[PDB]
Design a protein around this nucleic acid. Structure first.
Lengths: 120, 336, 63, 176
RNA sequence: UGGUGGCGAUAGCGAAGAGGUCACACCCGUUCCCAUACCGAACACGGAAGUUAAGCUCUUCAGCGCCGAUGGUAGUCGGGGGUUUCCCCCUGUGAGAGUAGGACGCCGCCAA
RNA sequence: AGUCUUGGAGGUAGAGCACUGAUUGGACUAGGGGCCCCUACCGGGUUACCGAAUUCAGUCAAACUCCGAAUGCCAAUGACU
């Protein structure tokens, strides 16, 4: 009857552990990333007002790919997020890794944002 | 549906097991009792449902310790009733098996007659599946001791390696003497006539073509032997001679006789003289005879005797190979 | 699987004196055995020798 | 393989139909098999820790851990942080191969093996042993064997009840 | 439906049902990235054979737990009195527990 | 400086068991003494001879608080003296 908690619980504990020191304010919103077994989602949020400024996902109809969970898909999602943040002139952003290690898809999305021009 | 008693016993077992599970579950969802258990779950020991229990908690319980593991007192009665239901089950099944024994005992004659009918049909149909499987024809099978194997083939050779021969015996002549050098078609012609006769006399179809005829002999006789091992060439002549003596004691007008190299393994003149005298002895019985020989003297035998026919096997001097073709009415020439 | 900290696993054909062959990933390339599962009497159901010698005493009143 | 296909094709469907589960993966599964050595005899023989570590690497390629005392004790002359026993966790093809080797050789190789303990079910659904002989199966090199103390094996399963775990083990081939 | 914040468990624990075609998770293996004092257990690497059991949602209950009155009581600033290791009166203030009751959740953003 | 007004820090009287301690009776109780039977201190039969632990109820605490006053202190905005 061995039982083990879900990965999402661990992910939330890690995300809270991270947010305990960082937060999103005006001219410096957060950049959250959520992993899914079939997708990945990114959002720009202002913790001061609890309002999202821009978001993206592998479900978007523009800049779409069939991989849906590959480094290339993450890079394209990051490029789209940076394009949205350029259209909406925030001019800055802070990275909020949702407890995930800055190794794979998260690193790819961050590098895509950096290359696009989103300065952390 | 076998009996209402069996249905009631099945209902008693399923309802009593469900009552066991519900009673265990009422113990296991009781919050005051959960402290005393190792687990809020059912377990089994010694073919009983039991509760898993903390070893230090021992004197608090009302139940039989199995191992702690405990069978509670309220379920001992249920498990005993289930045991009685298993006893009633096996009694019911033995009763129904005795009833089935009686119902089979009523239809003994029908079962035996159906078994005989199906064994007859399986025998008939297996023979016919074999007869179709070797692409073989019904022999025209006769009391006149007559054979006409049209385009006859040795059954133990492949259908593309074998050579087809017309063999006819027991009409215009009762004896055939196959003359010529020891070429592998003489003995193969003997074994072909013999095999196809035993196949045909059993109602098994023969590797010979449509309109073939074969004979209902009362007996078949063979002196067909390998010259085994040169330590024994007079054990060969003597063994052949002992077999020939045994054939001569028993042969009749209703007999087939097959002879390979009569009088071999001795002086050729004495061998040929023995062979002619043995063939004359057998020929007087009006038995059907096929003989082979390499002796020159026997090339005159079927010209000088009424009811005897000479034959030979065709040989290709250009390839140094036997053609295995039988030539009836033509004596064999030597080509040494 | 760490690099080099563990020995190389190799598929081997576990053999028995009775002829039974079993395959398991083992360090040894081959493993010779005398008593396999079926060879051991307990796995053979009611063993003949044990089922024959397990009778209770009868006081030896034969004589 | 030789065990995975057998399981998936005989134990899972049969046990599912027997227990009337509401889903396919509700069938209990053997999660892992943990092997432990337990010894603090290391107090008197510092090199004893090396023993059962070279043997465990041969039993299973997975190198064991040098577990250390989590608490000191005077009755045993122990101090926190000193090495005591060894641990191994088999998950994947390793546990299947270990089960195969065990069932095929170890149990039949024991001289007086008859009706293994039925008691040593957890209540919970796990099954637990302490082999007392250090040379149970052939990979232990009888010649190189000097000490005779066997191994703890702990079979862990997702079974919610001991009954279903017993059925799973019996169908797998545990000769109870 | 999912992600993301604020509000004091009136949010939480416990027991029973319904949901996955999407979505979220279970799941399949380690060739690739990464890794485990041992391990694809965890973290990663790609996918979708099947699974709604569990996680997660929608429902139910007052069982643990939580919030929680009014009145009165004790205590008490100030004034006064007495048999003064303490007690009593007056203006004002005013507890905890106990109850009556509430509650098995409310709103802000974004995508579908 | 005095107050009318507000918001604060705070753990004192009071009350209390929700922690740490002392403690009364009841239900139950693993375990330890005593008659002992045979008896490898192994197996029991009993005790109101004691009793860890749990549970119900009921007491006490300067250095115990799930709780918490009245008073006193700081300052501010609008006001009189």
């Amino acid at each position: 009857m061995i039982t083990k908690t879900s990965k999402n619980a661990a992910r939330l504990k890690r995300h809270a552990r991270v947010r305990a020191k960082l937060s999103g304010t005006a001219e410096r919103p957060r950049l959250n990333v959520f992993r899914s077994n079939k997708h990945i989602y990114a959002q720009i949020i202002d913790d001061v007002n609890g309002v999202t400024l821009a978001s993206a996902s592998t479900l978007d109809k523009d800049l779409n790919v069939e991989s849906t969970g590959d480094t290339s898909a993450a890079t394209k999602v990051g490029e789209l997020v940076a394009k949205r943040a350029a259209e909406k002139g925030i001019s800055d952003v802070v990275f909020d890794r949702g407890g995930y290690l800055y190794h794979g898809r998260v690193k790819a999305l961050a590098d895509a944002a950096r290359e696009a021009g989103l300065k952390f | 549906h076998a009996s209402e008693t069996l249905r009631g016993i099945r209902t008693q077992l399923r309802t009593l097991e469900s009552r066991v599970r519900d009673r265990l579950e009422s113990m296991l969802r009781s919050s005051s009792a959960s402290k005393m258990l190792s687990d809020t779950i059912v377990t089994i020991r010694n073919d009983r449902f039991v509760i898993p229990v903390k070893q230090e908690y021992r004197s608090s319980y009302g139940g039989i310790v199995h191992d702690l593991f405990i069978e509670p007192q309220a379920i001992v009665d249920m498990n005993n009733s289930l045991q009685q239901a298993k006893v009633k089950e096996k009694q019911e099944i033995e009763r129904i098996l005795r009833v089935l024994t009686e119902k089979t005992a009523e239809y003994t004659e029908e079962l035996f007659l159906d078994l005989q009918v199906l064994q007859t049909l399986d025998f008939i149909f297996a023979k016919a599946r074999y007869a179709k499987a070797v692409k073989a024809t019904k022999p025209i099978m006769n009391d006149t001791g007559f054979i006409r194997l049209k385009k006859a083939r040795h059954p133990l050779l492949p259908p593309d390696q074998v050579v087809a021969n017309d063999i006819e015996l027991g009409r215009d002549f009762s004896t055939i003497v196959i003359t010529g050098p020891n070429t592998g078609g003489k003995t193969v012609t003997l074994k072909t006539l013999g095999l196809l006769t035993l196949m045909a006399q059993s109602g098994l179809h023969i590797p010979a073509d449509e309109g073939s005829e074969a004979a209902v002999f009362e007996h078949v006789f063979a002196d067909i032997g390998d010259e085994q091992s040169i330590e024994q060439s007079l054990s060969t002549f003597s063994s052949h001679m002992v077999n020939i003596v045994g054939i001569l004691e028993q042969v009749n007008e209703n007999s087939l006789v097959l002879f390979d190299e009569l009088g071999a393994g001795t002086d050729p003149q004495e061998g040929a003289a023995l062979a002619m005298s043995i063939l004359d002895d057998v020929h007087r019985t009006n038995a059907r005879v096929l003989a082979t020989t390499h002796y020159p003297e026997l090339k005159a035998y079927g010209y000088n005797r009424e009811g005897v026919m000479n034959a030979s096997v065709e040989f290709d001097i250009e390839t140094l190979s036997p053609t295995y073709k039988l030539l009836i009415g033509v004596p064999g020439r030597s080509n040494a | 699987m760490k690099a080099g900290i563990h020995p190389n696993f190799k598929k081997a054909t576990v053999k028995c004196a009775c002829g039974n062959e079993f395959e398991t990933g083992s360090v040894k390339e081959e493993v010779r055995v005398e008593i396999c599962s079926e060879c051991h009497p307990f796995y053979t159901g009611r063993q003949k020798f044990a089922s024959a010698d397990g009778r209770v005493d009868r006081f030896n009143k034969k004589y | 393989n030789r065990l995975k296909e057998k399981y998936n094709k005989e134990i899972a469907p049969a046990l599912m139909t027997k227990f009337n589960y509401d889903s396919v993966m509700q069938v209990p599964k053997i999660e892992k098999i943990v092997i432990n050595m337990g010894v603090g005899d290391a107090v008197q023989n510092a090199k004893a820790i090396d023993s059962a570590v070279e043997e465990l690497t041969f039993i299973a390629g997975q190198k064991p851990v040098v577990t250390r005392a989590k608490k000191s004790i005077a009755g045993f002359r122990l101090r926190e942080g000193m090495p005591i026993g060894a641990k191994v966790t088999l998950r994947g093809e390793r546990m299947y191969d270990f089960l195969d080797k065990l069932i095929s050789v170890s149990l039949p190789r024991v001289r007086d093996f008859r009706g293994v303990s039925k008691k040593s079910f957890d209540g919970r659904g796990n099954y637990t042993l302490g082999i007392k002989e250090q040379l149970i199966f052939p990979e232990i090199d009888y010649d190189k064997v000097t000490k005779v103390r066997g191994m703890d094996i702990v079979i862990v399963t997702t079974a919610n009840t001991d009954e279903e775990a017993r059925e799973l083990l019996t169908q797998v081939g545990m000769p109870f």
